[PDB]
Each structure stands twice: as C-alpha cells, then as structure tokens.
Amino acid sequence: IVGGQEAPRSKWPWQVSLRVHGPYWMHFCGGSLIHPQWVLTAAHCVGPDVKDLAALRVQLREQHLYYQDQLLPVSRIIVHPQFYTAQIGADIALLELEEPVKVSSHVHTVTLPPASETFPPGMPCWVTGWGDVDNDERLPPPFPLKQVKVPIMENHICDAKYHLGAYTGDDVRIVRDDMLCAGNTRRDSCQGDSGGPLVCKVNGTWLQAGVVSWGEGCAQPNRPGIYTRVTYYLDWIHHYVPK
Amino acid sequence: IVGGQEAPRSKWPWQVSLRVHGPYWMHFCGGSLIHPQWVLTAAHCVGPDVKDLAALRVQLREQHLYYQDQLLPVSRIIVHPQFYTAQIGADIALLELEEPVKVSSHVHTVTLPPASETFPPGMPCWVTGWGDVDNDERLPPPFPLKQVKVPIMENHICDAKYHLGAYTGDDVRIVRDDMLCAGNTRRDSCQGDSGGPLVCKVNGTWLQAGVVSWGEGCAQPNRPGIYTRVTYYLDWIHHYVPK
Amino acid sequence: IVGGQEAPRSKWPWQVSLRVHGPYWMHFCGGSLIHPQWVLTAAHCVGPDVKDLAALRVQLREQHLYYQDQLLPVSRIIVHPQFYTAQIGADIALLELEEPVKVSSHVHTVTLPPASETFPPGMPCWVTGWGDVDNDERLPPPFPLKQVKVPIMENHICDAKYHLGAYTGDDVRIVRDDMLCAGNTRRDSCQGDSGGPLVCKVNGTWLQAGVVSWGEGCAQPNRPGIYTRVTYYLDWIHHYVPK
Amino acid sequence: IVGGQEAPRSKWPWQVSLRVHGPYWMHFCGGSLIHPQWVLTAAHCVGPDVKDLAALRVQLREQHLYYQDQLLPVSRIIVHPQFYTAQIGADIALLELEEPVKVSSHVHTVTLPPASETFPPGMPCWVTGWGDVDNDERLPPPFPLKQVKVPIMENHICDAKYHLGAYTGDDVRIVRDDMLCAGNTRRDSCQGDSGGPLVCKVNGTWLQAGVVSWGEGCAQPNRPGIYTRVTYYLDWIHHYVPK
Ligand SMILES: *[C@](=O)([C]([C][C][C][C][N])[N]C(=O)O[C][C])C1=NOC([C]C2=[C][C]=C(C(=O)[N][C]3[C]C4=C([C]3)[C]=[C][C]=[C]4)[C]=[C]2)=N1
Ligand SMILES: *[C@](=O)([C]([C][C][C][C][N])[N]C(=O)O[C][C])C1=NOC([C]C2=[C][C]=C(C(=O)[N][C]3[C]C4=C([C]3)[C]=[C][C]=[C]4)[C]=[C]2)=N1
Ligand SMILES: *[C@](=O)([C]([C][C][C][C][N])[N]C(=O)O[C][C])C1=NOC([C]C2=[C][C]=C(C(=O)[N][C]3[C]C4=C([C]3)[C]=[C][C]=[C]4)[C]=[C]2)=N1
Ligand SMILES: *[C@](=O)([C]([C][C][C][C][N])[N]C(=O)O[C][C])C1=NOC([C]C2=[C][C]=C(C(=O)[N][C]3[C]C4=C([C]3)[C]=[C][C]=[C]4)[C]=[C]2)=N1
C-alpha cells in the first residue's frame, strides 16, 4: 500500500493473507473473507496454471504478518475460466477453506455489492494489504496491515490516462469494462496487495467494489491502479458461494 | 536460445541486436533487417509506452555480442497501434534507421513471406538470437549468436496445449490467430531473443514466418514458444516499408 | 544460529539487538547487557571506521525481532584501539546507553567471568542470536531469538583444525590467544549473531565467556566458530564499565 | 581498474587472467607471467583453503576477456605459508602451469625487481586488470584490459591516512612493511584486479613492484590501494622459480 498508514486492529476484519510453502509460509497476495468458508482473490495470484493446493494456505486477519500465524488449509481453488492475464481481464478467483471460520467482530465476512451498485466518483473507498509501500520498496517488518483512501475515477477517464505517453491506439481499450480504477500518485495499492480488497462505505455499509488486480507500476502519473469490478462477476461467484 | 548451438558466421545475415543506453549499450532484444533502412522487431521490446530514440541503437549481425560493436542510430519507432501486451496480440513494431545499410553477403535483408504463404505444421524452421540458454540461465560470454531448428505447430494445437494444466476455459483463446507457434521441451527461444526472427526455407528462399513474442517459460512441457505471425501483418508493414 | 531452537521467553535476559538506520531500524549484530548503561559487542560490528551515533540504536531482549520494538539511543561507541579486523584480534567494543536500563527478571545483565576463569574444553555453553540458520540462509520471520548448546574446544585444537585443508603454515597462528572457539558441523553461530554472547553456567552462575566474532562460514567441517575471549579483555572493559 | 583507459594491445604482455570453472570459465583475479612456466598472483585469490586444481585455468594476455580464450591448466598452486588474510599480510602465491608457454613480443614475462629496490614516491608505476571500474560497478562487456597510472606513496604516509576517521590506535600498524601503497581518489585498482601486477619503469625496464592485494573500497578518500611488496618475498619466489 502506497500512502495511507497502519490500520487500527478493529478495521478490515475480512482482510486475509495468502501463503505459499517455502523456507517459511511467505505472503504473496491478499484476499478477503466473503463467506465463513470462502475467500475471494485475484486469479493471477493462483493461476492461470494449476497449483498444488498443499503448497497453499490462508491466514485470517492479522495486525502483523507472520507474528500470530494460524494457517488454514485450502480444499479448492476456483479460477474464473475467462482468465489468462490481468490486462486481459476476469482477474478473479475463489478459495474454499477446509473448514468454516468462526466469525467475530475481529474476523468476519465483507458484504458483496448488489448487481446494480456502480460506485460513482467522489466515492470514499479504501484498499488494504501488506504489499510494497512504493515501487520496488517492501513493507518493512514488523509488516503492519496498511490502509489507504483512494479516489474512484470513471473507467473512461482511466482508459484515456493510460493512453497518455503510449503508442496504443486511442480506440484500443486498455482499462476494460469488467475493471474499475482508483488511486493517484500518492495513494495506491502495489505488488503484494494483489487479490486484496477495495471497499467503499455505501449507505453506511461496507461493500467490496473491487479486487486489487494490476497497474503500470504504483502511484505513477497517468497510471491509476486497476481492480477487477466485483459487480461484473457476481453471477459467477454466487455459482459457488451461497447467498 | 534453448538447445541450440553457435551459428556459423555465414548464416543469419539479417539478425540484429537492439541496444538500450546505460553503463554500456546493452542488448535487450533481437530483430531483423527487412529493408536497408528498416528493422522488424516485437512491439513489447519498445512499447507500449513511448521511448526516447536517443537511448536506442541497432547493431547488425555480430558473431559475438559487444565485441565488434558498430552501433547505428534509429530515426523512428513504429509500434502497431493495436498493441498493449504480448498475450493480447499485435506484438510487432518497425524501426527506421537513420541511414540505409550497405548490403553484402555477411549482412543483408531477410525476405518477408507472401500474404498466402501458410507455413504448415512440421516445417523445419529456425529461430536465432543471443537470449538465455534456459529459464533464468543467461547466455555466457563471449555471447555467441545462437540458432536452433524448431518445429512449427498448428495454431489450434498450441492453443490446446496451453490449456493443459490451466484454469482457462478450453473455449477461451490463449494462442490467438495473429500468433504462430513453434518449439518443444528441448528447442525454443528465450528471454533476450524477443523481437528476433523465426525463418523457414521455402522454395529455396528464407522467409520470416514469425517474430519471437512470448511464452510460459522456455521449452516447458506443453508450453511451445509463441511468435507473432508475420503474414498477418504484411499490409501494416507495407504501409511503411517499401516493397 | 545454526542447529538451534527458539529460546524460551525467560532465557537470555541480557541478549540485545543492534539496529542501524535505513528504510527501518534493521538488526545487524547482537550484543549483551553487562551493566544497566553498557552493552558489550564486537568491534567489527561498529568499526574500525568511526560511525555516526545518530544512526545507531539498541533493542533489549525481544522474543521476535521488530515485533515489540522500544529502541534505545546510544551515547558512545568504544572500540578497542587494537582492533582492525576480526582475524587479527581485539574484536570487542562497548556501547554506552544514554539512559540506564531498569532491570527485571525478564531484562537484566549477564555476569562477566573472573580473570582466572578458563572454561574447560567440553563445558556446555550456549550462544544466542537472530543470525542466519545456516550459510547464506536468513532467519525467517517472525524472527525468533534462537539458541544452541555448543561445545567449547581448546584453543590449540581449533587453531589446528583451521589449518586442515589450508595452505597456512602449521606454526602460523590463525586462532589467536585472545580468541576462544566452540561448535561443530551441527551447532554454530552465524552472520547476524556477531557481537552476541557465548555464555556458560559456572557453579549455578551464567558467565559470558565469549563474543561472537568470526569463522569460515557456519558449522563447516574443521571450521569451529571463533569468539573474542572476554577474560582476555576484562581490564579494558573495567576501564569503562564500573564494577 | 578505476580511472584508467583501455590498454594498447602491445602493452602489459605479462598480464594474466585467472579462471574458475562454473557455467563458463569466469575471471576472478589477475596474475602475471614471471617465467615461461610460472604465474605470480595474490594468495587470497586462491587461498587460504586448498583448492581443486581442476577447477582452475589460466588465460594469457588477451585484449578482451572471454573473446579469444585458450585456457591453460595448472599443475601446482603454491601459497605463502604465512598467509591467511590480505590485511595480515604475505598476500602472494604461485601457479605452476602444466607446460611452458612460448613467449613472444605480445606475450612474455615481467621482470622482478632486485632485492634492494624501494620504489620511491612519484616515479610512475601502472596497475592493470579487468576488475571493476569503480565501487560495485563491473567492467562492461567486451571487457577490455584497462591500465592506469597510480602515484606511489611511502608506507608510513598511507598508514596514517588509514588511521584517519578510524578507531584503530595510531601505533597499531595497518599498512604493513611487506606491503606497498599507490593510487588516489581518481586512480586505483578494484575488485577483480587482485593478484594483478603493479609495474614501474625504472632505468628503462619494467619491474613488478607489487601485487594488487586489498583496500577499503576503491579510490576512496584517505584509503589508497594496498599491494603486496614483491621485493619482500623475492627469496620465497626463487625457492620455486628459476632464473
Ligand atoms: C499484485 O500485488 C499487483 C497489483 C498492483 C496494484 C497497482 N495499484 N499486480 C501485478 O503485479 O500484476 C501483474 C499482472 C501482484 N503482486 O504479485 C503479483 C503476481 C504474482 C502472483 C502469484 C505469485 C506466487 O508466488 N504464487 C505462488 C502461490 C502458489 C504457487 C505460486 C504454487 C503452488 C501453490 C501456491 C507471485 C506473483 N501480483
Ligand atoms: C523475450 O525474449 C521473451 C520471449 C520468450 C520466448 C519463449 N519461447 N518474451 C517475453 O518475455 O514476453 C513477456 C510478455 C523478452 N525478453 O524480455 C522481454 C521483455 C522486455 C522488453 C523490453 C525491455 C527493455 O529493456 N526495453 C528498453 C527499450 C528502450 C527502453 C527500455 C527505454 C528507452 C529506449 C528504449 C526489457 C524486457 N521480452
Ligand atoms: C557476524 O554475525 C559474523 C559471525 C559469524 C560467526 C561464525 N560462527 N562475523 C563475520 O562475518 O565476521 C567477518 C570478519 C557478522 N555479520 O555481519 C558482520 C559484519 C558487519 C558489520 C557491521 C554492519 C553494519 O551494518 N554496521 C552499521 C553500524 C552503524 C553503521 C553501519 C553506520 C552508522 C551507525 C552505526 C554489518 C555487517 N559480522
Ligand atoms: C581483488 O581484486 C581486491 C583488490 C582491491 C584493490 C583496491 N585498490 N581485493 C579484495 O577485494 O580483497 C578483500 C579482502 C579481489 N577481488 O575479489 C577478491 C577476493 C576473491 C578471491 C577468490 C575468488 C574466487 O572465486 N576463487 C575461486 C578460484 C578457485 C576456487 C574459488 C575454487 C577451486 C579452484 C579455484 C573470488 C573473490 N579479491
């Protein structure tokens, strides 16, 4: 997370960390608890190639990575079939935990937005994760969970910005429809926050508007962060996660 | 190049090396001379964002990289407008040299295929360059130009193989129609060969069938090297390069 | 620490961690509290060249590095004047804290040995620290303080071992008289444990027999860990640290 | 070499490159031909630990490293028995080739100095090699042999400079008698140059005054390069090399 600060421990009770087996269970991506037994994340975090589930584990809300670990095994990795690369799209996936989690005020599910929700600009949204604090700059130990308020911008405004200083034809769409954008040169998600959640308080309730997907670098001029647009894939999600 | 051998001095007189400015004019991609003043390469080697021409140079056929440098300046970079990422497509670009090159037996242009040429699967073709000799395995000094005979494969077969061990739906195109594909687990192009040529001998004349584009690793199981089909973009090339 | 185990929270109340200013206060060496206002460490950790005090901090006993940080400024660095390199000798130094520390059962000084103590070869001693778990293998987060029982070995014997598989003449001393050694191919201290303590319990009292100094790799055959013999420099320490 | 330039092809016909087996025979140190069958280098290049001769080869004068390699096997590695680390001293060793090299105008031995030569300050000496052109930055390909004129300075003047900005006591000698120093903040040998020669034209003939041994960094303020003083080890050399 670029900009922002360490989040209070009472916030983002749905934030999760994905771990890959290695010299130690290292965090490679973020994710969110959308149901006691399911975790929503980015497809590029776990695919497009098939992974060995044994080498993967989930860590529920933690104020500091690795310090109070209670790794949870995974039984299924469901990746949207239209996915191949983040730039192309459909960068979304599901992880089914091996057991349901006991929810509480410190750890519970995030609410998904209704299919109608559009998240207009001037929309106070936040993004969180344990990713880099800048380009090629790791979150230093003790690895606190960070949060940052990011401005939502219209898809067409972002697509245009991405063509600035680029050879790509103006009519060749970069920021696609199943995508959503937010952030600026001071606030943005970065390597390590991927799969994590972008949430907005609407009508007094937190809804997950997006999933950290990609961007050209982090907080770079004319290159706002791109996120998978959750409302676009609700039907797919609900085909696995109970309503 | 993976699984190849050093190329004799008399072969591949069109192979060129692209240099970017830094502590020394370092090779970042390959290319091919298709006209005395034009170099054909891969768009991702120079795009999608616009580059400073002063930081770029072209080096004609060299038996060993860096040893006999005779860097040539570039006057114009033309990246196909439909390009954004190699996986999406249109990974082809043109480089216009400041001056036309004096052709000879050691250094001269390669012939472009005719719009109807259809390099069928099985046809022995060759790919060349100074790229890695294996995944994460750089080419050792003195950096000899390498070559390797790779078998071409039907577009649909390559696409199919890319779906094996992947979450991507079988109906979702991975190897697109503007791409060509060749190689196996023992022969393949690799990081550093990008923008380089894949040529085949047809009716006694060498034709460039492709441009090294992308691939999942190098010479990996069910992951043949993907190239930009030149026939697909002949009209775009002739909008600039004299026939 | 090689071949060790995480230390119980009630053990090694004198272990400290030295931090240097950068992206965060990173550990670079260990040390021991030998007096409320004094920390004993290795000269190569802070010398031979003079260092800016403002960029240095001390961290008292921590179960996990970076977790519960409460950094303490340093008022003075005293490096033995005879020190130039660890192989030459006199690898010992003193750190004076700006404020005296408030001891307790969880955080208190280690006892220095009397000038006659010898520490017989075979005397179970322990070495502690947050250094690597093996040659070129960092301690993985959450960075638990480690410990290992290492057997002390006679000075001549270690000097002898270092000659095995070496061109150095048998009469040329490698392990010198102001040094002590301990460990084997399974137990040793390693990069990051430097400046840390080597304690032995003599008649129900823990005495710091050594200071982690150097060695050829860690836990390598015939290359036992070398430490700065504390008894050898008691007079120098007492010229600064009160009784 | 720091602050020099490419050496003319006809100079330094005694320069040698030491190669270690690996993905390719890589250069790790320099050396000099002081006899048709012997190479003089630095002890720390091959010791203090005994090495497997097979993994070592020697390359004679070459304008560009790796370009025209004709690696010669080594039959014996003789390291001065008093050696353990460069700072301590006796940083000198001998390599006996498996066969005599045929000398010529382009490749011949360097002349060793008479036991009574002190090499006074001023008198021009040069140091050559394929090492870094500055701290932490390697010689760029095509790796040309570089040369540079370095001013020699009296041992005691350099010893004092090494004490500036350091804790080491003024009377604790750093630059030792069996050592010689040369260079400044703009001219010096660096990593990769070790074992190489420092030659001075005296009375119309080139004599090897020293061997690139060590230094605190390269071309750093008050830290001139240090070399093993050849005249000091003449008897030792002649114990193996004829006349
Ligand atoms: C993301 O953090 C970034 C988002 C940047 C936000 C801009 N505002 N996205 C990105 O880089 O996208 C490029 C298309 C991110 N960080 O790193 C990645 C890519 C990535 C995914 C997965 C791994 C990984 O190590 N996976 C493991 C997990 C696992 C494996 C491999 C094998 C078997 C079991 C489990 C590394 C990097 N995206
Ligand atoms: C290619 O070699 C590989 C091909 C693999 C074949 C497998 N069978 N393709 C690839 O990796 O594709 C990913 C989509 C290759 N190697 O490295 C790259 C990517 C790349 C492109 C360009 C640079 C680079 O340094 N460009 C310079 C040019 C320039 C710059 C930056 C600044 C100013 C002026 C000019 C690095 C890496 N593809
Ligand atoms: C030690 O851990 C090892 C011990 C190995 C035991 C074998 N059984 N010793 C070693 O490597 O010695 C070789 C002579 C160790 N690890 O790393 C070092 C060297 C070192 C010294 C100092 C720093 C450092 O970052 N210093 C800071 C302090 C400071 C600075 C620089 C600037 C301003 C203010 C304060 C890093 C590494 N020894
Ligand atoms: C020297 O170039 C420098 C000189 C600096 C001059 C400043 N004015 N010295 C130095 O860095 O000293 C540190 C005390 C140099 N560069 O690198 C080294 C150290 C070194 C020695 C040996 C190797 C090596 O790879 N050896 C091989 C050879 C061999 C091996 C290992 C195994 C089996 C057979 C043969 C690397 C680096 N000194």
For position C97, which CATH number holds? 2.40.10.10
Reduced to 3 states (helix: H, G, I; strand: E, B; else coil), residue D212 is: strand
Q: Which residues lie across from A153 on neighbouring strands?
A: A181
Q: Which residues lie across from D187 on neighbouring strands?
A: D184
DSSP-derived letter for residue B137 is B
Structure tokens at D121: 């300050």
Catalytic residues of A: 44, 91, 194
Write out residues 208-227 of D within 8 Å (CB-CB) of C.
216
Q: Which residues lie across from D6 on neighbouring strands?
A: D146
Structure tokens at C29: 């060496």
Spacing of C-alpha D62 from chain mean position: 16
Q: Which residue has the tokens 């616009």?
A: B50
The span from the CA of D51 to the CA of D128, in Å, is 25
The span from the CA of C166 to the CA of C159, in Å, is 11
Which residue in A211, D116, D48 sits closest to C222, CA to CA? D48
D191 and D116 belong to one structural domain: yes
Label the pairing between strands A5-6 and A15-20. unpaired
Distance from CA of C125 to the nearest CA of A (A): 28
Amino acid at B49: D
How far, in Å, is the centroid of ligand 4 from the Cα of A161?
A: 51
**In whole angstroms, how far apart are CA A36 and each of A100, A193, A199, B2, B100?**
5, 22, 19, 48, 67
First to last CA, chain C: 31
Reduced to 3 states (helix: H, G, I; strand: E, B; else coil), residue B74 is: strand
| Residue B160: Cβ-neighbour burial (10 angstroms; 0-12, 13-18, 19+) | middle
C23-36 burial: b if 16+ Cβ within 10 Å, else e: eebebbbbbbbbbe
Structure tokens at D31: 């050396």
Is residue B198 within 8 Å of B143, Cβ to Cβ? no
The span from the CA of B158 to the CA of B176, in Å, is 10
Give one DSSP letter per residue of A178-243, joined into a string. TEEEE--SSSB--TT-TT-EEEEEETTEEEEEEEEEE-SSSSBTTB-EEEEEGGGGHHHHTTTS--
Chain D residue numbers touching C49 (CB-CB < 8 A): 165-167, 216
B73 preceded by a cis bond (ω within 30 of 0): no
Inter-chain contact D165–C49, Cβ cutoff 8 Å?
Answer: yes
Structure tokens at C36: 């409320």
Ligand 3 pocket test, pick from C188, C191, C222, C223 with the greatest ligand atom count within 8 Å of Cβ, gives C191
A19 and A127 belong to one structural domain: no
What are the φ/ψ torsions at residue C102 (nearest 5 degrees)? -90, 95
D226 and D238 belong to one structural domain: no
Spacing of C-alpha B125 from chain mean position: 13
Query: How were these coordinates obtained?
Result: X-ray
Report the residue count for chain C: 243
The span from the CA of D83 to the CA of C238, in Å, is 34
Spacing of C-alpha A78 from chain mean position: 16
- Going across the sheet that includes D225-229, the strands are D5-6, D146-150, D125-129, D197-202, D205-214, D225-229, D179-182, D152-153
Q: Which residue has the tokens 């490419």?
A: D6
Is residue D93 within 8 Å of D230, Cβ to Cβ? no
Reduced to 3 states (helix: H, G, I; strand: E, B; else coil), residue B33 is: strand
Q: Which ligand is closest in space to the CA of residue C134?
A: 3
Is residue C85 within 8 Å of D173, Cβ to Cβ? no
A85 and A53 belong to one structural domain: yes
B217-227 burial: b if 16+ Cβ within 10 Å, else e: ebbbeebbbbb
CB within 8 A of C183, min separation 6: which ones?
Answer: C2, C127, C150, C151, C189, C215, C219, C224, C225
Inter-chain contact B47–A167, Cβ cutoff 8 Å?
Answer: yes
Report the residue count for chain D: 243
Chain D residue numbers touching B23 (CB-CB < 8 A): 137, 140
Q: Which ligand is closest in space to the CA of residue A213?
A: 1
DSSP-derived letter for residue A55 is G
The helix/strand count (H/E) of chain A reads as 3, 13
Structure tokens at B174: 């991975």
The two most distant CA atoms of chain A are separated, in Å, by 51
The span from the CA of B84 to the CA of A163, in Å, is 10
Q: Which helix (H) or strand (E) holds A97?
A: strand A93-97
Structure tokens at C153: 């070995």
The span from the CA of A64 to the CA of A24, in Å, is 16
The two most distant CA atoms of chain B are separated, in Å, by 51
CB within 8 A of B63, min separation 6: which ones?
Answer: B7, B9, B144, B145
CB within 8 A of B41, min separation 6: which ones?
Answer: B18, B29, B30, B31, B32, B92, B93, B94, B95, B195, B211
How far, in Å, is the centroid of ligand 1 from the Cα of A149?
A: 22
C48 preceded by a cis bond (ω within 30 of 0): yes
The span from the CA of D11 to the CA of D19, in Å, is 21
Q: Which residue has the tokens 């390099």?
A: B119
Chain B residue numbers touching D143 (CB-CB < 8 A): 141
Report the residue count for chain B: 243
A73 and A149 belong to one structural domain: no
Is residue A32 within 8 Å of A208, Cβ to Cβ? yes
What are the φ/ψ torsions at residue D28 (nearest 5 degrees)? -125, -20
Residue B148 CB less than 6 A away from ligand 2: no
Which residue in A10, A142, A139 sits closest to A68, CA to CA? A142
Amino acid at A84: Y
The span from the CA of C155 to the CA of C157, in Å, is 5
Instruction: Return contacts of B217-220, CB within 8 angstroms, 24+ apart.
Output: B217/B135, B218/B2, B218/B132, B218/B134, B218/B135, B218/B188, B218/B189, B218/B190, B218/B191, B219/B2, B219/B3, B219/B134, B219/B135, B219/B183, B219/B184, B219/B185, B219/B186, B219/B187, B219/B188, B219/B190, B220/B135, B220/B185
Is residue C1 within 8 Å of C129, Cβ to Cβ? yes
The span from the CA of B70 to the CA of D102, in Å, is 34
Q: How many CB atoms lie within 10 A of CB D88?
A: 17
Q: Which residue has the tokens 């860690």?
A: C218
A227 and A237 belong to one structural domain: no
Structure tokens at D123: 């008198």
Q: Which helix (H) or strand (E) holds C210?
A: strand C205-214
Which residue in D239, D208, D216 sits closest to D96, CA to CA? D239
Q: Residues D141, D147, D150, D155: is their CA dihedral positive or negative?
A: positive
- Number of C-alpha atoms within 13 angstroms, CB side, residue B48? 23
- From C44, which residue of chain D is nearest by alpha-carbon distance? D167
Angle at alpha carbon of residue C45, lines to C40 and C50, rounded to 5°: 100
Is residue A24 within 8 Å of A10, Cβ to Cβ? no
Structure tokens at C136: 């070129």
Reduced to 3 states (helix: H, G, I; strand: E, B; else coil), residue C89 is: coil
D110-146 burial: b if 16+ Cβ within 10 Å, else e: bebbeeebebeeeeebbbbbbbbbbeeebbebbbbbb
Q: Which chains touch D (3 or more CB pairs under 8 A)?
A: B, C
Q: How many CB atoms lie within 10 A of CB C108?
A: 15
Residue A20 CB less than 6 A away from ligand 1: yes
Structure tokens at C226: 């070398």
**In whole angstroms, how far apart are CA D71 and each of B228, D52, D66, D94?**
42, 16, 10, 17
The span from the CA of A14 to the CA of A231, in Å, is 18
B156 and B237 belong to one structural domain: no
Phi-psi region of B203 (alpha: psi -120 to 50; beta: other; left: phi over 0): left
Q: How many CB atoms lie within 10 A of CB C167?
A: 22
DSSP-derived letter for residue B138 is P
Q: How many CB atoms lie within 10 A of CB C214?
A: 18
C6 and C28 belong to one structural domain: no
Distance from CA of D96 to the nearest CA of B (A): 26
Structure tokens at B173: 């195109």
Amino acid at A110: V
A116 and A202 belong to one structural domain: yes
Amino acid at A227: Y
Structure tokens at D142: 């095509």
First to last CA, chain B: 31
Structure tokens at C197: 């303590």
Give yes or no: B44 in active site: yes
The span from the CA of A130 to the CA of A138, in Å, is 9
B6 and B119 belong to one structural domain: yes
Candidates A49, A88, A167; nearest CB to B165: A49
Q: Which residue has the tokens 């040893």?
A: B67
Residue D214 CB less than 6 A away from ligand 4: yes
Which residue in B198, B195, B160 sits closest to B182, CA to CA? B198
D63 and D101 belong to one structural domain: yes
The span from the CA of B228 to the CA of B91, in Å, is 6
Q: Which residues lie across from C206 on neighbouring strands?
A: C201
Is residue B69 within 8 Å of B27, Cβ to Cβ? no
Residue B194 CB less than 6 A away from ligand 2: yes
The span from the CA of A62 to the CA of A139, in Å, is 15
In chain A, how many domains are there? 2
Residue A191 CB less than 6 A away from ligand 1: yes
Structure tokens at A55: 């080498």
SS3 content of chain D, % helix, strand, coil (to 5): 10, 35, 55
Chain C residue numbers touching A66 (CB-CB < 8 A): 141-142
Give the range of the structural domain holding residue D25, as residue numbers without chain letter: 13-109+232-243
The span from the CA of B117 to the CA of B112, in Å, is 10
Of the candidates B91, B132, B178, B188, the residue annotated as catalytic is B91
Write out the E strands in D12-71: 15-20, 26-35, 38-41, 56-59
The span from the CA of C96 to the CA of C69, in Å, is 19
Angle at alpha carbon of residue D224, lines to D221 and D226, rounded to 5°: 150
Q: Which residue has the tokens 């502690």?
A: C128
A128 and A188 belong to one structural domain: yes
